[PDB]
A paper describes a structure:
Propionyl-CoA carboxylase (PCC) and 3-methylcrotonyl-CoA carboxylase (MCC) are biotin-dependent carboxylases (BDCs) that catalyze the metabolism of odd-chain fatty acids, cholesterol, and specific amino acids. In contrast, PCC and MCC have their BC, CT, and BCCP domains divided into two chains: the α subunits contain the BC and BCCP domains, with an intermediate BC-CT interaction (BT) domain between them, while the β subunits solely consist of the CT domain. In humans, PCC and MCC catalyze the carboxylation of propionyl-CoA and 3-methylcrotonyl-CoA (MC-CoA), respectively. (**A, B**) The side view (left) and top view (right) of human PCC holoenzyme (PCC-apo) (**A**) and MCC holoenzyme (MCC-apo) (**B**). Both holoenzymes are dodecamers consisting of six α subunits and six β subunits.
Using the same batch of purified BDCs ([Fig figs1], H to K), we also determined the cryo-EM structures of human PCC and MCC holoenzymes in the acetyl-CoA-bound state (referred to as PCC-ACO and MCC-ACO) at resolutions of 3.38 Å and 2.85 Å, respectively ([Fig figs2], [Fig figs3], I to L, [Fig figs4], I to L, [Fig figs6] and [Fig figs7], [Table tbls1] and [Table tbls2]). The overall structure of MCC-ACO is also similar to that of MCC-apo, but alignment of the CT-N subdomains shows that the position of the BCCP domain and the conformation of the acyl-CoA binding pocket in the MCC-ACO structure are significantly different from those in the MCC-apo structure ([Fig fig4]). Specifically, the BCCP domain moves towards the CT-C subdomain in the MCC-ACO structure compared to that in the MCC-apo structure ([Fig fig4]). Consequently, the covalently linked biotin moves from an exo-site to an endo-site that is deeper in the pocket formed by the CT-N and CT-C subdomains from two β subunits ([Fig fig4]). At the exo-site, the ureido ring carbonyl oxygen of the biotin is about 8 Å away from the main chain amide of the catalytic residues G437 and A438 ([Fig figs10]). In contrast, at the endo-site, the distance is shortened to about 3.5 Å ([Fig figs10]). The acyl-CoA binding pocket, also formed by the CT-N and CT-C subdomains from two β subunits, switches from an open conformation in the MCC-apo structure to a closed conformation in the MCC-ACO structure ([Fig fig4], C to E), with the major conformational change occurring at two helices (residues 474 to 517) in the CT-C subdomain and one helix (residues 243 to 252) in the CT-N subdomain ([Fig fig4]). The acyl-CoA binding pocket of the CT domains shows a different conformation in the MCC-ACO structure compared to that in the MCC-apo structure, and the covalently linked biotin is relocated from the exo-site to the endo-site. In the crystal structures of PaMCC in complex with CoA, the CT domains also adopt a different conformation in comparison with that in the apo structure of PaMCC.
Numbering used by the authors:
A (entry chain C): 499 to 640, 648 to 715
B (entry chain F), C (entry chain D), D (entry chain J): 23 to 563
Write the structure that this text describes.
C-alpha cells in the first residue's frame, strides 16, 4: 500500500514548488525591458518584518499545512505541524532533466523534480513520492419567469402534472425568434397562470408549484 | 508572472443528438455550396478568354498574385462574390478585379489586380466600389497598395453609375493622392492597356513598372483619337513602353515580361524603408481546446432557434480562455477579454434581444477598451431592440444611443462578424457597415434586413388599414395573401448572404472553421496603424 | 567600451576602536527596538478581533496582500507607523490601513487594504492622510491602484478632522476620478461592508470584484436609513452581492470567497494591456564592496558627532563606484554620479553646514541632472545654513534660494533619505517633504525640527528680555531653568522619528542595511513614468 | 440678432406674510452680527500695537493695500475670519495676514500682506494655511502675486504644526519657484524684518523692493546668531537696505519709505508686459429685475424649512433671464444657462434631496458645459442622497458617482456658493472644497457636517446597542440623554459658518446682497487663465 510522506519529503515538495515559481518569474524577466531590476528576485523581503507563506500540500488523502518563512539569507524555515526545518536548495539541469538540490537541517540530498498539472514527483535513490497540490474551488466548479413581452405559443403542462429538470414548459415567440421556457425546478405544476395565446410580460411568473 | 492557472470556456456537445446532426448536415450543405460557387468564380471569364490571354504571353491574374507575394504566405482575398448575379444577363466574376491583403517582401500590402479576362478589364460599377473599398482598407490600416493594372476603361451604357458622383471612379485618384501624401506607398505595374481612366493609375503612383511591348498608357487611345480628333495611330508607338520609359518619362522601371515585372516589384517594396512597430502587448499564441466543425454542429442554419455565443468564443480564442465582464447584468450581451494569436481582443457578442441593461453594459465595456487600446470584435446575432411600453418608459432609445455613440466614436481597430441575423437599429449598436469597422465578414447562414419580412408585411398592412379607414373597407384574405406573398419573398431574397456580398456590403462570406485564421490575419493587418486617443461625444445620462 | 578600470570609494573601519563599538551598540539598540515595535504593529487589533474576523470566513489583510502579489516577490510597505501614539487612549495600528507597492501579474501596483481588525475599519484622520499619500504616489509614478475595501465609514467624534477640508476624505474620490482620466487603472475588491463613504470607492473604480454573501455596498446602511428615513432593512438584501451583480449593476465580477476575489484580481491586472518602457540607460547591477552593518558602526546615534557621507555612498551604490563632482569647492556638500541596481543616480549628500559655495555647487549639479534626465537622491544630514555677518554680506540667502528654486523646479524622480538631523531652511534646500520627493525615508537616529531646541529656548528668552526691556526686570535663574525645561523637552519629543512618522511626514523608518534594497525598489517604481523636460524659474545671479 | 424677447424668472414675495417678516428679521440679525465681527477684526492687534507700528513710521497694512491698488477699485478680500476663536487664549485677527484680489496698474493681482500688528508678524498654522490658499488661487487663475513682507518667522510654541509636513511653511517657497517657472510674476516689497523663514520670500521673488532703514533680510538674526554661533551684530548693518542694495545684491529696487515702495510696485507691475485676453463670449451686462434684501426675506435662517432656488437665481443673474435645462426630469436639481456681468454661466442648484434622475441630469449638464467652455456655479443646499432600499436597488450610488466623476474631471472655472446645509456625499456631488473650485463662499445661515447631528447620535446609539448585544443590556433613558446631549452640541458647534471659516475651509462668509458682486469679481479673476480641454474618466453606465 501507499505510505505517508515524511516531513522532510514535504519540505522538498514545497521547496520545488517555490523554486518552480521563481523559474517562471525569471523567464518573465528575461523577456522584460526592465532588466536587472529588483522585484525580480523572489526573496520575499518585507520591510522590517518577515514573510511567512502558508501553503497546503495533500499527502495521499490528508492535507498538511506548511508555514514557510522567507529568511534574509535565502534560506527557508518550514514549520510542518510543529517541527521547524531549515530548508535550502536550488534547481539545476542535466541535459533535458531538472533536478532539485536540497539541504534540510544539514542533510543534503538530490531528487529529480517533475511537476505535472497538480502532482509533484520526486524521484530519488530511496523511492518515488507523489505529492498533490490542492485545487481551489473556483477553478473546479465548472419558479420560472417570462423573458420578454411576447405572445405565448404552446403550453406543455397542466394543473397537476409532474415534470423533470430541463423539460419544455412553455414556448413564446418574441419579435424575431423562439424562446422556450424550460424547467429547472422540481415538484408538481398546480398552476398554469397564462392561457394559451396570451401576452406574457418580462420577469413574470408562468408556472407555480406548491 | 503569468504562471497561475485559470479556467476555460466551452463544453463538448452531444454528437449523437438529432439537433446536432441536423445542424451539422445543414451547415455542411451551405459550406459545400459556398466552396463550389467560389471555385466557379476562380476561373474568371471562361476558357476562351483565358486562352486568348495566355496567347499574348501574359499570366493569369491569380498567377500574378501568386508570383508577387512571399512563397507559401497566405493571401486574404476580399469580396470574392462581388457582382454575383447583380447585373441581369452579364456575368462579372469577382467584380472584374481581385483585391486582397498579402505579404510582399515581408511587408503586408494591399494588392489590387485588374482581372482582364472578364469584359477586357472593363470597369463596372461594382468594380469601382470594390476597388474603393480596398483603397479605404489600405488608408485605414496604412498598407502599401500595389495595383496590377490591366484595365479597359469605364463601361459605356452604365457610364452614369460609373462616372460623376462622389464615390465614383474619380475617387480612385483622390485616394491615391491622399495616401501618397501620408507616406503610404503606391506601386503600379502596367501589364495591360490603360485607356484614359486607367491611364491615371500609373501616373498617380510613386513608382511604375511597365512591361516591354505589352503595357500601354495613353489619355486617348486609337479609336478615341479617331472619334475625338480624327487620327489614326498605332497603339504600341502611341503609348508603348519605349516611349514612356525613354522620352516622356511616365514610367520608372522597365520590365521584359511579367515575371520581370513581379521581381522588380518585390525589389521596390524592399526599398521602402518600412518597419512595423507594435504598440499592444503580445503573448505566446496558443490553439483552442475544441475543434471548429463543432461550430457547424452548434450554429446550424435555423435563425429562429437560438444558441449560446460562448460556444463560438470557446472555439476561436487562445486556449479557450476568456475573462467575462459583468456576466450577470444584462446577460443578452456577452462582453469580455480574450486573445487571438497573442493579440488582446475585447469581444462583444449577442445572445438575445437588446434590453437597456445590455446596452449600458456594452457602453461601459467599449469605454474600457478604448481607454486601454484593446481591439474590438463584435459578433452579431441580433433580432431586435425590445419593443414594448414599459421599455420605452425607461429610456431604451436613450440607452441604445449610448451604445451607438460609443461604438461610433471609438478609435481602436473594430472587426465585425455576422454569425446570425442582423436587423434594425440593433445592427447599428453592434458596429454595422456604416460605423467603419476595419473588416466585416459573414457566415453563410446570416440574414440582414431592416426587420424580418413578417414584421414589414404586418406593419404595411396595419398602416394601410389605418390609412384607408378615413373611408374604410376591407379585402381581408385577399389583402393578407397578396401582401404576404411579395414581401416575404422580397425580404428573404434581399436578406441572403450572396445578395449582400454581391454588392460590397461586406468583406466576404467565410467558412466557420476558417473564422479563427481570418480574424488573426485581419487583426495583424489592422495593427499596422498606431492607435489614436478616443474622444467621445456627450453621453446622455 | 566600458572595459577600462576605475577606482572606488570607502575604507574599512577600525572594528576595535571604542568609537565604532559604542556606535554599533547604540544603532543596534535602535534597530532592535524598531523591529519589536513593528512586530507588535503587525498583529493589528488584537487576537480577539482577529478571531472574530476569521470566524466570518475572511482572511486577515496581510494574508490578502500575500495572496494577491506575485509569489516570492518583495513588498514595499509604506508608513507602518502611522497613528503610533497619536490619539490619546485609542490605539490605531498601522493607521488602520495598509499601503504598499507590490508586484501583481508582473506589473508594479499600489495596494491599499482596509485593515478591518482595528476599529471595524473606521477612518481616523491619519487613515485619510495615509491613503491620500498612497494615491499621490500612484498618480506621480503612474501605478495602478488596487483597493481592498473592508471599510467602516468615517469616525464620528473626529468628524471635523475627517470631513470638509481640501485634503479630507472627499479628495479620495477626486483622486480616483483624475487617475482614471489619465489611464491609471483603479481596481476595487469589495471584501467588507462599505457604508456611505466607502460605498463611493467601488463605484468610482473601473472594475469591481465583490464577494458572495460577504461584501456590501450601500449609500445608507440599516441604522443610517433608520435615523434618516425611518426604515428597517436587512443588510445582505439591501446591498449584497446578488443585487449589485444582477440588478443594479454596480459590480462587474462576482467572487465566491476571498481566494476567488484575489485570483480574479490577478486576471484583471493581466488584462490591462500595460507594458513598462524605460528611458534611462541600464547597466549590469553589482553589489558594493563593503557590508551594511558597518553603517551601524559609522553612523551611531550621536548627532553632535559628525561623520563622512562618503562612507554611506560606499555602502549603497553599485561596486562602490562614484564619480565625484566639484570635490574641492564647497566640500560640505558631496555631489556625484553613481548607480543603484543599474540605474543612474545623481547623489547629493550633506557633510556639514551649508555655505554659499556649497549651494552654488548644488544648483549646478541639479541643473546637470535635469538636463540629462538622471534621478536624484538627497542624503540629508543638516545642522544649519551658516549664520553670521560676513555670510549675509555675500548673499548666503541669495544662494540658498537658488538651491531651493532648482530643487523645486526639477522634473526628475527625487528621493530623500534623512540619515541625521534636518533643521531649518536647510531642510528645504535638500528636498524636504514640501518639495514633492517621490519617497522620503528616515533612519532611526534622525531628528527634524525648525531648530534644535537650545536655539529656540535661547531666541525666545533673549527676545522676551528685549521685549520686556520697555520696562525691564529680570528673573535670571528662574527664567533660565523654567524656559530650558519645557522647550528642550518639547523639541526633543517632537523631533523623534516616531513622532514624525506617526503622522505621515515621511514614508517610513528604515533599517540602515535595508537602505540599499529600499532605494532600488523605490527607484524602479519611480521609473514607470516618463521623465518630462524641466523648466526653471529665474535664477537670481 | 439677439433682438427677440424672452421671459424672466422670479416672483415678487408677500412682504406682509409672517414667514417673510420672521425670515427677514433672522437674516438681518445674522448679517448685522457678521458686520460687527468683521469691524472688530479690521483693527488688528489693538490700538497699542498700532501706535507702536506707526511710531516707527510704517503704514498699517490695510493702508498699504489701499495705496497699492488702483484708486476707487474694489478689493476682494479672502478669509477675513481665519483664526477666529481657533487658538485657546490667543487672538489672531484675520489669520495674521491679509490676502485678496485687487487691481494694480490695470492688472488683477493677488496681494498677500503680513499684518505685523498681530504677534509681530508671527506665522501661526492658520497663517501658513491661508497664505498657501492664496498662492494656489494665484497659480490656478494665473494672477501675479505681490507679497508685502513684514514677517516675524515661524511661531515656535506650535512649530510642529508649522514646520515639516507637505502643506507646511516650506510649500510657500515651492509655490514661488513653480509659479515663476510658468511666467506668473512674483513681487516682494520688504517693509519689515524677515527673520530666517521670511528671508526666503524676497530672495525667491523676481523683483524686490526694500525700504531704506526699515526693511531687513537675514537668514539668521541677532539672537539667532547669538544662540547658534555666539555673535553680537546690529540688525540694520547685518541685513539692512544698504548692504543688500549695494553689496550682496538681494534687492533690486530701493525705496525711501512705504509710499515710495508702493509707487515703485505699481511701476513694476506696469512693466510686466501682460495683456488679458478673453476666450468666452461677452454680452452687455444688465442688472436683475429684483432687489437683494428680498433674499433675506426668502432664505431666512431655518434650515428645516425649504425654499426655491429659482428665487436666488432670479436675483443674481443678468436681467433675471435663465434658460432652464431639463426642467421636469429630476426636479430637485435646477440646471440652466444664465449670465453674470456678461459672462456665460451654467448654474447647478439644489432644491431637495438627490435622487438618481437628478444626478443623471447633473452629469449631462456638466458634460455640456465642459464641451462649450462655460463656467459653472454650484449653489449648495443639500440634506442628503436619498437613503432607502428601492433606491439602492436601482443604483443610486452608481449615479452619484457619475456626478462626482464629472465634477472632478471638469476643467472649466467652477465656483461654489453654500446657501444652506451641505451634508454627506451630497457635498462631494456639488463641488465641495475637495473638488478644487476656484472659490467657495458661504452665507451666514449655512451648515456643513458629515450628516446632521441627530442622525449621528442615532447611528452611534443603534450600533452600540448592536455591538453590546453580544452580551446585551440597556441603559435606555440614560444612554438616550447622555448621547443626545454631547453629539448634538458638538455637531451644531462644528457645523457653524464661523467654525468652518476659522479654518480655511472656505473663502469667506458673504452677505446675501453682496453675492452678485462677489460672483462677478471672482468670475473675472477666474478668466485670466485659458480654459483647457476636459478629459473624463470612465462613466459607469
Ligand atoms: C471613355 C472612357 O471613359 S473609357 C473608354 C475607353 N475607350 C475605348 O473604347 C478603349 C477600348 N479599347 C481597348 O483598349 C480594348 O478594348 C481593351 C484593351 C480595353 C480590351 O482588350 P482587347 O483584347 O482589345 O479586347 P476588346 O476590347 O477587343 O474586347 C473585349 C470586350 O470588352 C469590351 N470593352 C472594352 N472596353 C470597354 C469600355 N470602355 N466600355 C464598354 N465595353 C468595353 C469590348 O466591347 C468587348 O466586349 P465583348 O465582351 O462584347 O466582346
Ligand atoms: C454616517 C457616516 O457616514 S459616518 C460613520 C459611518 N456610518 C455608519 O454606519 C456608522 C456605524 N458603523 C458602521 O458603519 C457599521 O455598522 C460598522 C462597520 C461599524 C459595522 O461593523 P461591525 O463589523 O458590526 O463591528 P462594530 O459595528 O461592532 O464596530 C466595531 C467598533 O468600531 C466602532 N465603529 C465602527 N464603525 C464606526 C464609525 N463609522 N464611526 C464610529 N465608530 C465606528 C464601533 O463603535 C465599535 O466600537 P468598539 O470598537 O468600541 O467596540
Ligand atoms: C523662529 C524662526 O524660525 S525665525 C525667528 C527667530 N527669531 C526671531 O524672530 C526673534 C526676534 N524677531 C522678532 O520677532 C522681532 O521681534 C521682529 C523684529 C520680527 C518683530 O518686531 P519687534 O519690534 O521685535 O516685535 P516684538 O518682538 O516686540 O513682538 C512681541 C511679540 O512677538 C512675538 N514673536 C515675534 N516673533 C516670534 C517668533 N518667531 N516666535 C514666537 N513668537 C514671536 C513674541 O512672542 C512677543 O510676544 P508678546 O506679545 O508677549 O510681546
Ligand atoms: C426583426 O429584426 C424584428 C423586428 C425589428 C425590431 C424593430 S425594427 C425598428 C426598431 N428598432 C429596433 O432596434 N427594433 C425595432
Ligand atoms: C539647528 O538646526 C541649528 C539652528 C538653525 C539655523 C537657523 S534656523 C533659521 C535659519 N535658516 C537657516 O537655514 N539657518 C538658520
Ligand atoms: C443629513 O445630512 C442627513 C443624513 C445624511 C445622509 C447620509 S450620510 C452618508 C450617506 N451618503 C449620502 O449622500 N447620504 C447618506
Amino acid at each position: 500500500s501507499r505510505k505517508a510522506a515524511a516531513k522532510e519529503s514535504l519540505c522538498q515538495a514545497a521547496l520545488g514548488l517555490i523554486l518552480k515559481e521563481k523559474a517562471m518569474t525569471d523567464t518573465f524577466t528575461l523577456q522584460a525591458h526592465d532588466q536587472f531590476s529588483p522585484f525580480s528576485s523572489s526573496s520575499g523581503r518585507r520591510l522590517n518584518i518577515s514573510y511567512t507563506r502558508n501553503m497546503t500540500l495533500k499527502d495521499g488523502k490528508n492535507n498538511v499545512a506548511i508555514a514557510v518563512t522567507y529568511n534574509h539569507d535565502g534560506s527557508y524555515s518550514m514549520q510542518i505541524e510543529d517541527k521547524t526545518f531549515q530548508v535550502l536548495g536550488n534547481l539545476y539541469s542535466e541535459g533535458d532533466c531538472t533536478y532539485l538540490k536540497c539541504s534540510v537541517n544539514g542533510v543534503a540530498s538530490k531528487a529529480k523534480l517533475i511537476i505535472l498539472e497538480n502532482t509533484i514527483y520526486l524521484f530519488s535513490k530511496e523511492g518515488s513520492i507523489e505529492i498533490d497540490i490542492p485545487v481551489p474551488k473556483y477553478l473546479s466548479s465548472v419558479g420560472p419567469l417570462a423573458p420578454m413581452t411576447g405572445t405565448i405559443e404552446k403550453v406543455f403542462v397542466k394543473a397537476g402534472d409532474k415534470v423533470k429538470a430541463g423539460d419544455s414548459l412553455m414556448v413564446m415567440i418574441a419579435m424575431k425568434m423562439e424562446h422556450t421556457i424550460k424547467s429547472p425546478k422540481d415538484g408538481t405544476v398546480k398552476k398554469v397562470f397564462y392561457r394559451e395565446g396570451a401576452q406574457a410580460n418580462r420577469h413574470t411568473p408562468l408556472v407555480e408549484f406548491e | 508572472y503569468h504562471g497561475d492557472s485559470v479556467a476555460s470556456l466551452g463544453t463538448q456537445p452531444d454528437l449523437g443528438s438529432a439537433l446536432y446532426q441536423e445542424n451539422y448536415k445543414q451547415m455542411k450543405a451551405l459550406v459545400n455550396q459556398l466552396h463550389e460557387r467560389v471555385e466557379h468564380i476562380k476561373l474568371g471569364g471562361g476558357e476562351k478568354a483565358r486562352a486568348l490571354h495566355i496567347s499574348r504571353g501574359k499570366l493569369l491574374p491569380r498567377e500574378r498574385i501568386d508570383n508577387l507575394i512571399d512563397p507559401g504566405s497566405p493571401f486574404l482575398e476580399l469580396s470574392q462574390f462581388a457582382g454575383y448575379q447583380l447585373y441581369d444577363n452579364e456575368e462579372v466574376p469577382g467584380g472584374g478585379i481581385i483585391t486582397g491583403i498579402g505579404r510582399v517582401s515581408g511587408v503586408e500590402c494591399m494588392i489590387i489586380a485588374n482581372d482582364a479576362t472578364v469584359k477586357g478589364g472593363a470597369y463596372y460599377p461594382v468594380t469601382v466600389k470594390k476597388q474603393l473599398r480596398a483603397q479605404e482598407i489600405a488608408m485605414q490600416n496604412r498598407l502599401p497598395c500595389i495595383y496590377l493594372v490591366d484595365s479597359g476603361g469605364a463601361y459605356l451604357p452604365r457610364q452614369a453609375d460609373v462616372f460623376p458622383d462622389r464615390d465614383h471612379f474619380g475617387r480612385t485618384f483622390y485616394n491615391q493622392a491622399i495616401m501618397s501624401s501620408k507616406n503610404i506607398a503606391q506601386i503600379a505595374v502596367v501589364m495591360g492597356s490603360c485607356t484614359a481612366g486607367g491611364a491615371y493609375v500609373p501616373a498617380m503612383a510613386d513608382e511604375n513598372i511597365i512591361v516591354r511591348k505589352q503595357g500601354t498608357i495613353f489619355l486617348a487611345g486609337p479609336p478615341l483619337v479617331k472619334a475625338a480628333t480624327g487620327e489614326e495611330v498605332s497603339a504600341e508607338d502611341l503609348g508603348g513602353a519605349d516611349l514612356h520609359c525613354r522620352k516622356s518619362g511616365v514610367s520608372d522601371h522597365w520590365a521584359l515580361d511579367d515575371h520581370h515585372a513581379l521581381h522588380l516589384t518585390r525589389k521596390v517594396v524592399r526599398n521602402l524603408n518600412y518597419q512595423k512597430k507594435l504598440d499592444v502587448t503580445i503573448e505566446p499564441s496558443e490553439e483552442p481546446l475544441f475543434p471548429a466543425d463543432e461550430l457547424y454542429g452548434i450554429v446550424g442554419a435555423n435563425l429562429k432557434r437560438s444558441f449560446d455565443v460562448r460556444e463560438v468564443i470557446a472555439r476561436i480564442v487562445d486556449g479557450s480562455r476568456f475573462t467575462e465582464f459583468k456576466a450577470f447584468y444584462g446577460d443578452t450581451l456577452v462582453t469580455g477579454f480574450a486573445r487571438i494569436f497573442g493579440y488582446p481582443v475585447g469581444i462583444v457578442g449577442n445572445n438575445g434581444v437588446l434590453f437597456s441593461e445590455s446596452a449600458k453594459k456594452g457602453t461601459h465595456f467599449v469605454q474600457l477598451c478604448c481607454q486601454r487600446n484593446i481591439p474590438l470584435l463584435f459578433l452579431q446575432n441580433i433580432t431586435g431592440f425590445m419593443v414594448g411600453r414599459e421599455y420605452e418608459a425607461e429610456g431604451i432609445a436613450k440607452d441604445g444611443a449610448k451604445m451607438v455613440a460609443a461604438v461610433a466614436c471609438a478609435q481602436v481597430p473594430k472587426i465585425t462578424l455576422i454569425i446570425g441575423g442582423s436587423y434594425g437599429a440593433g445592427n447599428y449598436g453592434m458596429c454595422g457597415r456604416a460605423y467603419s469597422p476595419r473588416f466585416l465578414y459573414i457566415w453563410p447562414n446570416a440574414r440582414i434586413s431592416v426587420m424580418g419580412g413578417e414584421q414589414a408585411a404586418n406593419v404595411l398592412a396595419t398602416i394601410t388599414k389605418d390609412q384607408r379607414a378615413r373611408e374604410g373597407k376591407q379585402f381581408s384574405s385577399a389583402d393578407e395573401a397578396a401582401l404576404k406573398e411579395p414581401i416575404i419573398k422580397k425580404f428573404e431574397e434581399e436578406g441572403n448572404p450572396y445578395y449582400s456580398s454581391a454588392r460590397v456590403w461586406d468583406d466576404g462570406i467565410i467558412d466557420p472553421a476558417d473564422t479563427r485564421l481570418v480574424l488573426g490575419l485581419s487583426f495583424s493587418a489592422a495593427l499596422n496603424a498606431p492607435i489614436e486617443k478616443t474622444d467621445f461625444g456627450i453621453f446622455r445620462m
